[PDB]
């Protein structure tokens, strides 16, 4: 178990990196297959039957998300016969190749792919490899890029912010509360791509450094919201403002380093003059703060810390590269004169 | 020709609402890979006729891949099967 | 570990001769010369057609009597 | 289609009010038809007769709000100085939006009918006058 | 043994993944893919290649469809049924099934039926067009599967395949 | 298009059958060798097979006199030779080894030819300088042009990054 | 032309003989385990290793020899590492 | 934009370089002089004073990095307006050459209260 | 993104299996082998955003070869040229 717990989990990496290094349509094929193959027995670990019933509900989902791409294939095999990853040369191709493709990145559409999978699961240790899946079909939008329909892509995006701004109003399980608002940031840097493909990546990154941090902060006892109620006088009070520090930057406020990005999505989007599209999403992005609050209000108020049981022994977790976590996504927003130039 | 359009029907064997659903789980991941063959022989026909020669490994490591993918799933369902019996996918209780 | 090879040949006498034809088959074709004499056939058989060039001044060698010593010798095999 | 948009700026401009509405009724008589799709299969198994989802006349309300959706246009554009104007397009909004105010009835959900509904059609006609694009290219 | 003998078969070979779309009470459906893989098998010998198609009788046919067919068996215990005898299951068996020689009906029966479905004609030996003969070397389509360049390939696939055992090696 | 006429056609193809064909098919190209190969160069470096249809008939003659020439001094052990290699099967050079000899004790001798053993069928040759070189191929419409390029002077940011504020 | 009228007399024989056999001359007037389920799926991981394994007597009228020669051996290397950890845990079988 | 799959080319010779002394570079390890702090602040020091050697190499993390990231940064910029200028350079109708008048020709609207 | 390692360090992972005219392992072409070889020629140093204005051409004719679609027009009208005046005569040509 031990040794190829490392073994099962280096192949993920090494699936996304063929779907990086490639010129040809079948190793990308063969690249996200295999990763597909690879997130299996992570889900499983303690063969509890209510992760099984949540892998197999995540495993026929992605199984048509491969077997649909390889159906957009072999139409440009028919038509010009090229396999080098450029235009499609079909729009009734490349129609199939978006929305099949926007599976994985999971949109508006496709509504419970993302939270009934990660409820569920009692590994909520990570779990943060499902960042890795958000990492993977962008490296391939780079360059399906200058041949899209250019209504659909933009309609998945509009669509996709307006349903998750909605859904943690209903919520206290605060991994749903995390499924949610990764429909929100999927549906950003997808919005800009028709735009400079380039400084999409820069809202990707952002994305994983935020998300990187959550859960590592999730990871001292807490996965229901009133359990984050029972920790700044229990386990530690320093963890109180640093939970604060995170909740309210990913919200976007501009003396924070988290709404950095929305900063420049502007500055690219319009001198384009597409005004009306912006303004619908920055004033959507209102309420990807009031999940925020409403939930600070909970650990930083000490709200009514009962069940006594006193933790007076130390703590030894695996805080890994942790600490250095938050301060890139705090104080990185003056720290930022050309992150558009290294990136891109 | 004739001998695309059909076949190209046979590619819509994959009716999600028959590719799910109903219950007796096993029709639906036949289905699946019932998928697969629509697949390797549509990409056959035109690999074979305009003479490439070097595209036939792709339909072969194509079924490399479509059982490997089908060897999968086909395990899940004895781990349903194994405490239940039966498969009946109107089992659910983990809800979104 | 002497005795290894002499408790386990009497102990499973299955395996053991397997690892003897992993053996002494990775390593000889390594080895004897009659390797490389597979390459020069492997390629020396036609399967398809030679054609001939244009001439323009040079004539570096082979003029177009195919029975004259103008081109290589395989004819070795037929010796062989 | 975009051939029943394109249909729909060029033509009528306030007159011709018999085939007015009959191209405005088509985008109001279709909309209601996406929603009666999620109405049966997000909604859970209905009676003997699918479609026969759970409150049914969705397609009974969409096709005359949208009846009268370019209806209030050509009457008003008719009479009043023969423009097509923002406060001549506004009126459509109000009265079109109280027939879900009369269905599913008032004082609570009617009483925002006529508000929300009147602002957001004036502002259509003003999106064609200034040379507004919503989906703009280089 | 008619010109159309090759099209005639594709046309058979739709109707077979229609007699499991719906509920074949899954016993059947290993019966409905039999019948439909092996006409499949038959398109594919056609057009030179002979080696390529043969392989899906081993590999799938006589390969996943048999552990297939191990399955429901150790799963499944209750009571099954002969399909058609049922009224779940016949609801729409000939709702796609009319379509089926619908499409044939007017793609070239008429003279122009009419613009963009009338494009391909039926027949008559453009079906095959692949005049004039070869060599002697191969098929070809023989000279295939080739340890030449494609290598990449090989170790990526089969280092694919080693970690499939060992999922499966763990939990069953 | 065009196509050439009716004319330039019907001439003496060589009707023989298949197995008296393949009977000699050594002796035959390994001493004509003039029109084969500018036949060769006249289909794969220059294509179009209509530009080239002369030396098709060419060649085609020089077989019509070569049977004739067989014909009317050693036929006997010819046509004994492929009589065993008619009765078939996969057409094995093997079978009729012993029959062989009898052949091909006068072809060096009556007529005086060679027993062309392996040195046939290889080593690609020049030919001579017939016709011109069919330069300006087939089309070759344009290339066409490219787009021009910068060399310039590497110098820093005018006043540094220009983005909103930012001084440097 | 007879592939195809080849076997089609062979097949119209056996339901032929059924007749005679069962009709007309007649006239009568599961619990699960899983020490068998896991060597099925073994067996098709090494039925689609010996597929790609397959083309191998084409794959020697080739060109430079040790690219096939060293990589045919590799999949064999593939073949037998995937026994040994699962030699480890074979059950009752 | 050619020669890919490089963190700088070495066409970047032509650089100051954006040398050290700079606020930015200062910054870039002032947070990391934060940063050790928070990493006593967590496993309970309780010091936030604490031993050097953990309160030292975020320091040497961050100014080297910084240092190594600013060397493209400012070439990127650079080789952005290296293309530039020949293109402005090139295509003289699509620069035109406007003619600058006085305000004696200017008749604006003219709008007083 | 597409980092390109394969461009610094200059070994192919495929970059062989692409196009219809790379490698042919025997030297035997394909149908529409004579066209990529003047296709590819077209745009090379074109930054493929006015190649869908400039060359336009080349790719037609290559794009028609793969399917020899207006000839399977051309020659379908002509059963409408005859063949619709089967019982008015011309037989046209005699055999043989
Ligand atoms: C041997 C290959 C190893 C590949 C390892 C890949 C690890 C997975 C990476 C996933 C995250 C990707 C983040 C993108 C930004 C990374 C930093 C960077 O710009 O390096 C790319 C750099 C800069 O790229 P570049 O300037 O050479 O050209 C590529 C341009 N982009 C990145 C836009 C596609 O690439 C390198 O040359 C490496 C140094
Ligand atoms: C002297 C430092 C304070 C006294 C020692 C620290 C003891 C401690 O652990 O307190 C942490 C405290 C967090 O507050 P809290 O968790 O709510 O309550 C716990 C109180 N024991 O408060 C904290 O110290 C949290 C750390 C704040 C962020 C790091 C700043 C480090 C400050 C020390 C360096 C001073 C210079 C930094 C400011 C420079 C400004 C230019």
New binding site residues.
């Given amino acids: 178990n031990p040794i190829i717990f490392i073994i099962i989990l280096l192949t993920i ?1 090494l699936g ?2 063929i779907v ?2 490639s010129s040809h349509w079948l190793l990308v094929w063969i690249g996200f297959e295999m990763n597909m193959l690879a997130i299996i027995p992570i889900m499983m670990k303690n063969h509890n039957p209510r992760a099984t019933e949540a892998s197999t509900k995540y495993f026929l989902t992605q199984s048509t998300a491969s077997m649909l791409l390889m159906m957009a294939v072999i139409i440009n095999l028919m038509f010009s016969g090229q396999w080098t990853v450029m235009k499609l040369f079909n729009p009734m191709a490349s129609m199939l190749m978006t929305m099949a493709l926007a599976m994985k990145l999971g949109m508006a559409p496709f509504h419970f792919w993302v939270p009934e999978v990660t409820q569920g699961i009692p590994l909520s240790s990570g779990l943060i490899l499902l960042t890795w899946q958000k ?1 993977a079909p962008m490296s391939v939008l ?1 360059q399906i890029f200058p041949s899209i329909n250019l209504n659909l892509i933009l309609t998945l995006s509009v669509l996709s912010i307006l349903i998750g701004g909605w859904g943690g109003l209903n919520q206290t399980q605060l991994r749903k509360i995390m499924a949610y608002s990764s429909i929100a940031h999927m549906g950003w840097m997808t919005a800009v791509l028709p735009y400079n493909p ?1 400084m999409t ?1 820069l809202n990707l ?1 952002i994305y994983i450094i935020m998300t990187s941090t959550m859960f590592t902060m999730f990871m001292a006892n807490s996965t229901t919201t009133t359990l984050s109620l029972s920790h700044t006088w229990n386990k530690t009070p320093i963890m109180t403002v640093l939970i604060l520090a995170t909740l309210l930057s990913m919200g976007g406020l501009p003396p924070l380093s988290g709404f950095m990005p929305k900063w420049m999505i502007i500055q690219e989007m319009t001198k384009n003059n597409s005004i009306i599209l912006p303004t619908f999403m920055a004033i959507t992005a209102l309420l990807n703060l009031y999940f925020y609050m409403r939930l600070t209000y909970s650990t930083t108020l000490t709200m009514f810390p009962s069940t006594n049981n006193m933790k007076m022994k130390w703590q030894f977790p695996l805080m890994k590269k942790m600490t250095f976590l938050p301060t890139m996504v705090v104080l990185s927003t003056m720290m930022l004169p050309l992150t558009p130039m ?3 | 020709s004739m001998v695309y359009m059909n076949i190209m029907m046979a590619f819509t064997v994959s009716l999600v609402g028959l590719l799910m659903y109903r219950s007796h789980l096993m029709s639906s991941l036949l289905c699946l890979e019932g998928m697969m063959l629509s697949l390797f022989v549509m990409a056959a026909l035109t690999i074979l006729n305009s003479h490439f020669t070097l595209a036939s490994m792709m339909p072969i490591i194509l079924l490399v891949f479509a059982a490997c993918e089908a060897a999968l799933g086909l395990s899940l369902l004895v781990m349903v099967s194994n405490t239940y019996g039966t498969d009946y996918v109107q089992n659910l209780n983990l809800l979104q | 570990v002497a005795a290894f090879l002499k408790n386990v040949w009497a102990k499973e006498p299955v395996l053991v001769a397997s690892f003897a034809i992993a053996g002494l088959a990775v390593i000889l074709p390594t080895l004897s010369p009659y390797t490389k004499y597979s390459l020069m056939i492997n390629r020396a058989t036609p399967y398809n057609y030679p054609v001939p060039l244009r001439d323009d001044g040079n004539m570096p060698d082979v003029p177009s009597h195919p029975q004259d010593p103008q081109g290589p010798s395989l004819e070795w095999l037929k010796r062989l | 289609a975009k051939t029943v948009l394109r249909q729909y700026w060029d033509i009528p401009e306030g007159t011709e009010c018999h085939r007015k509405t009959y191209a405005t009724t088509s985008i109001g008589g279709a909309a209601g038809l996406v929603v009666s799709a999620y109405s049966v299969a997000l909604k859970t198994p209905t009676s003997f007769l699918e479609g026969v989802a759970r409150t049914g006349r969705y397609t009974f309300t969409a096709a005359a709000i949208g009846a009268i959706f370019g209806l209030t246009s050509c009457i008003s554009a008719q009479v009043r100085e023969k423009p097509d104007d923002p406060l001549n397009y506004l009126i459509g909004g109000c009265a079109g939006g109280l027939i879900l105010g009369a269905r599913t009835r008032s004082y609570g959900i009617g009483a925002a009918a006529c508000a929300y509904m009147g602002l957001t059609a004036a502002l259509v006609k003003m999106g064609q006058l200034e040379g507004w694009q919503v989906f703009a290219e280089p | 043994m008619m010109l159309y003998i090759v099209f005639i078969l594709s046309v058979i070979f739709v109707m077979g993944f229609v007699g499991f779309s719906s509920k074949p009470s899954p016993i059947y459906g290993g019966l409905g893919l039999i019948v439909s893989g092996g006409v499949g098998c038959g398109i594919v010998l056609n057009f030179g290649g002979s080696f390529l198609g043969l392989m899906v009788f081993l590999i799938y046919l006589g390969g996943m469809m048999v552990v297939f067919g191990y399955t429901t068996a150790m799963a499944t215990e209750q009571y099954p049924e002969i399909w058609l005898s049922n009224k779940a299951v016949l609801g729409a068996f000939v709702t796609g099934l009319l379509m089926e020689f619908f499409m044939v009906y007017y793609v070239l029966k008429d003279k122009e039926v009419e613009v963009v479905f009338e494009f391909n004609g039926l027949g008559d030996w453009v079906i095959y067009d692949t005049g004039d003969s070869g060599f002697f070397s191969e098929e070809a389509m023989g000279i295939a599967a080739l340890y030449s360049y494609g290598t990449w390939l090989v170790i990526v696939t089969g280092w694919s395949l080693l970690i499939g055992v060992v999922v499966i090696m763990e939990i069953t | 298009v065009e196509l050439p006429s009716l004319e330039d056609l019907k001439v003496q193809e060589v009707k023989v059958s298949s197995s008296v064909l393949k009977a000699a098919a050594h002796h035959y190209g390994a001493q004509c060798d003039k029109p084969n190969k500018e036949f060769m160069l006249c289909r794969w470096e220059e294509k179009d097979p209509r530009r080239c249809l002369e030396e098709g008939k060419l060649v085609n003659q020089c077989a019509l006199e070569f049977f004739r020439q067989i014909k009317r001094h050693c036929a006997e052990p010819f046509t004994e030779y492929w009589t065993c290699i008619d009765y078939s099967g996969l057409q094995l050079f093997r079978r009729c080894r012993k029959q062989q000899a009898q052949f091909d004790e006068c072809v060096l001798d009556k007529l005086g030819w060679v027993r062309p053993d392996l040195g046939d069928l290889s080593k690609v040759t020049k030919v001579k300088t017939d016709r011109p070189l069919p330069e300006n191929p087939y089309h070759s419409r344009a290339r066409p042009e490219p787009n021009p390029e910068v060399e310039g002077d590497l110098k820093p940011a005018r006043h540094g990054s220009r983005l909103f504020f930012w001084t440097m | 032309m007879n592939l195809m009228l080849a076997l089609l007399t062979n097949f119209t024989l056996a339901t032929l003989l059924v007749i005679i056999a069962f009709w007309l001359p007649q006239l009568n007037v599961l619990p699960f385990s899983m020490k068998f389920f896991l060597v099925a799926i073994t067996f098709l991981l090494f039925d689609l290793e010996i597929a790609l394994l397959l083309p191998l007597p084409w794959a020697s009228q080739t060109a430079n020899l040790n690219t096939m020669l060293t990589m045919a051996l590799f999949l064999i290397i593939l073949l037998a590492v995937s026994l040994a950890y699962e030699w480890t845990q074979k059950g009752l079988e | 934009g050619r020669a ?4 700088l080319p070495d066409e970047a010779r032509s650089l100051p370089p954006p040398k050290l002394t700079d606020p930015r570079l200062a910054f870039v390890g002032f947070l990391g002089y934060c940063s050790g702090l928070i990493d006593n602040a967590i496993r309970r020091r309780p010091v936030l004073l604490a031993g050097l050697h953990r309160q030292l190499l975020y320091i040497t993390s961050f100014v080297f990095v910084g240092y190594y990231l600013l060397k493209r940064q400012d070439y990127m910029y650079a080789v952005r307006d290296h293309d530039m200028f020949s293109y402005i350079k090139s295509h003289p109708e699509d620069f035109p050459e406007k003619d600058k008048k006085t305000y004696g020709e200017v008749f604006e609207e003219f709008h007083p209260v | ?5 394969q461009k610094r360090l200059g070994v192919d992972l495929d970059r062989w299996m692409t196009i219809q005219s790379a490698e042919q392992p025997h030297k035997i072409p394909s149908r529409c082998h004579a066209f990529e070889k003047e296709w590819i020629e077209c745009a090379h140093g074109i930054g493929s955003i006015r190649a869908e204005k400039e060359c336009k051409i080349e790719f037609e004719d290559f794009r028609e070869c793969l399917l020899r679609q207006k000839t399977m027009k051309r020659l379908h009208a002509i059963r409408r040229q005859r063949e619709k005046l089967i019982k008015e005569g011309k037989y046209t040509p005699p055999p043989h």
């Fill in positions: 990496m996304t990196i990086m290094i990492l780079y380039t990546l990154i290294l990136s891109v | 890919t799959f490089q963190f | 993104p597409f980092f390109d390692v």
